[PDB]
Design a protein around this ligand. Structure first.
Ligand SMILES: CCCC[C@H](NC(=O)[C@H](C)NC(=O)[C@H](CCC(=O)O)NC(=O)[C@H](Cc1ccccc1)NC[C@H](CC(C)C)NC(=O)[C@@H](NC(=O)[C@@H](N)CCCNC(N)=[NH2+])C(C)C)C(N)=O
Ligand SMILES: [Cl-]
Ligand SMILES: [Cl-]
Ligand SMILES: [Cl-]
Ligand code: NA
Lengths: 99, 99
């Protein structure tokens, strides 16, 4: 699809069998989602945003559907103001920015 | 252009007569620039993201050149870790996400 930016670019995602809303975020290196349970082991990561740094849980090789497109990759879990789909998974679904 | 997202979508901007590098951020409602002086009146604002909130100065009707495209709108100025072009100006240069 072609998504204009007059509103937040919110899409439905599916992760763990659960549907959630997430923001397509070209300004995010990584994908970050609100607290939820994911399978497997996790590793620590610190990420930065506009207000400073937070600790998150890094889960690798997680199956996630984004706007009906399948991705398998790293998902960070932690106290984020919004579920965000970052460039690691935007590249998997072939997204580009155009103007 | 068409910008792929293998790397951060960084562009050159001109604001207040200054050249800066900035990130095209579809996950940002607002445009936020590192500390600088801008003309006219401003008002205080709090903006949030990962890590919490920062206090910024809100200037309205500011013109910015983004990768050669002029746009006008509100620019926020404050202690942001990165210069960010948000949706309020991305819309004006006709930026879309496509996949
Ligand atoms: C080479 C990598 C080294 C570092 C490596 N990476 C990072 O930490 C990278 C740089 N961080 C980022 O890319 C993070 C996203 C998290 C992540 O990807 O991990 N990006 C971001 O946080 C970018 C801006 C940014 C970019 C780079 C540096 C700093 C800031 N903004 C995304 C963020 C989304 C929002 C839902 C929380 N938007 C914002 O922060 C904007 N905020 C807004 O638009 C708000 N009004 C809306 C949400 C807030 N909620 C609320 N008020 N209830 C703001 C810029 C005007 C790491 N630490 O592992
Ligand atoms: Cl990944
Ligand atoms: Cl505006
Ligand atoms: Cl349009
Ligand atoms: Na003004």
């Amino acid at each position: 699809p072609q998504i204009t930016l007059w509103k937040r670019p919110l899409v439905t995602i599916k992760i763990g069998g659960q549907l959630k809303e997430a923001l397509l975020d070209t300004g995010a290196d990584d994908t970050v989602i609100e607290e939820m349970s994911l399978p497997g082991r996790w590793k620590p990561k610190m990420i930065g945003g506009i207000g400073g740094f937070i600790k998150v849980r890094q889960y690798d090789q997680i199956i996630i559907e984004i706007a009906g497109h399948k991705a398998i990759g790293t998902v960070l879990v932690g106290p984020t103001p919004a579920n965000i789909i970052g460039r690691n998974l935007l590249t998997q679904i072939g997204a580009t920015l155009n103007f």
